Nucleic acid binder design. Structure first.
Ligand SMILES: Cc1cn([C@H]2C[C@H](O)[C@@H](COP(=O)(O)OP(=O)(O)CP(=O)(O)O)O2)c(=O)[nH]c1=O
Ligand SMILES: [Cl-]
Ligand SMILES: [Cl-]
Ligand SMILES: [Mg+2]
Ligand code: NA
Ligand code: NA
Ligand code: NA
Length: 326
DNA sequence: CCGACAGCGCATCAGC
DNA sequence: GCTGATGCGC
DNA sequence: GTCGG
């Protein structure tokens, strides 16, 4: 938080470009700038000083100078008074409502939390649960609660079958004091890149976690990716815990290290690392690292026995999860 | 000093 | 229904 | 919006 005011401004600028301008490249440029400033040590005192960091060009620089001068950005002070974009920004905070849907609702005259309530029929399933738990999903999760959710999820998957391996990734694996949701990587020997012997492996896990009333709702469900809602159990007379977003991602066991690298993130770190693989002539996704040819087509998967192997290939020093919070 | 910008699962739609 | 495009979230 | 070429 040495340049919290600046990175906040940049993050709000990015939010606007994504939600209102629907210019996803402006969005990503601001958030690259926000993150490189966020880890930059000591107080930024000038747009030109900032300019030295990669991803900050002239326009961010003149914005930083204005912010440092006045404490404000006029550009944002008008965005915050513009009633239409302010309504669009707000609706995208419901999970499952993004730019298109947010602007669709606002055109129809549906502009506040109440308006969504008076209309749960114009909302797809994901959007209704996002609305149901709107206040809950804006709350972070203390690591202590994350640790309890970890023990539940793990002891339940082992109840289904003792060869499941579940790994809590996301901000938790990076060591964060709090997380926005809970991310679970799931491997089972039966499911590799060679074939799935029998699917439903993710369903059985979801089913069990539901039967014990940990998973309370579903946002999306498929054979390898579950997105839903879960809740810790409270004790007698105690206030209930908030409900929590939970994503579970089943990955071929032979592709674990690529999957755990993917799912540990952050999303910005994943994007730098993948852009850098491409410059090195490699492509990385959550399953494999593969060489880039001369034509550009991905070659065949390179062999991987650790996260560090992935790093070695693109000639990065190994970064521990803790230092991946970009 | 203009093209590329990371990559993919699931849900929903439109045109068959 | 299937295919491919888009929306959304990760 | 930014930058490597
Ligand atoms: C949103 C997003 C995510 N991920 C990968 C990396 C994430 O670390 C991981 C988990 O997604 P998410 O839970 O949204 O991010 P997080 O790092 O755990 C931050 P929070 O604690 O708020 O969940 O998915 C991406 O690779 N690209 C993305 O755009
Ligand atoms: Cl642009
Ligand atoms: Cl489809
Ligand atoms: Mg998370
Ligand atoms: Na720069
Ligand atoms: Na949303
Ligand atoms: Na997540």
């Amino acid at each position: 938080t040495l340049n919290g005011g600046i990175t906040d401004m940049l993050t709000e600028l990015a939010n606007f470009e994504k939600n209102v301008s629907q210019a996803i490249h402006k969005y990503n440029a601001y958030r690259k700038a926000a993150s490189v400033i966020a880890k930059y040590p000591h107080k930024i005192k000038s747009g030109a000083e900032a300019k030295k960091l990669p991803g900050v060009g002239t326009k961010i620089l003149e914005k930083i100078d204005e912010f440092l001068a006045t404490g404000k950005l006029r550009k944002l002070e008008k965005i915050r008074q513009d009633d239409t974009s302010s309504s669009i920004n707000f609706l995208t905070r419901v999970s499952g409502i993004g730019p298109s849907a947010a602007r669709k609702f606002v055109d129809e005259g549906i502009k506040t939390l109440e308006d969504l309530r008076k209309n749960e029929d114009k909302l797809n399933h994901h959007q209704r649960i996002g609305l149901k738990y709107f206040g809950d999903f804006e709350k972070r999760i203390p690591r202590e609660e994350m640790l309890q959710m970890q023990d539940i999820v793990l002891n339940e998957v082992k109840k289904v079958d003792s060869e499941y391996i579940a790994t809590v990734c996301g901000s938790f694996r990076r060591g964060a004091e709090s997380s926005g949701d809970m991310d679970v990587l799931l491997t089972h020997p039966s499911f590799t890149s060679e074939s799935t012997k029998q699917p439903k492996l993710l369903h059985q896990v979801v089913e069990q976690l539901q039967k014990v009333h940990f998973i309370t709702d579903t946002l999306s469900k498929g054979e390898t990716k579950f997105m839903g809602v879960c809740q810790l159990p409270s004790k007698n007379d105690e206030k209930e815990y908030p409900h929590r977003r939970i994503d579970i991602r089943l990955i071929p066991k032979d592709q674990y290290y690529c999957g755990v690298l993917y799912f540990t993130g952050s999303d910005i770190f994943n994007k730098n690392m993948r852009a850098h693989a491409l410059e090195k002539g490699f492509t990385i996704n959550e399953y494999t690292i593969r060489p880039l040819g001369v034509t550009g087509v991905a070659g065949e998967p390179l062999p991987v026995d650790s996260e560090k192997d992935i790093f070695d290939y693109i000639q990065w020093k190994y970064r521990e999860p803790k230092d991946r919070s970009e």
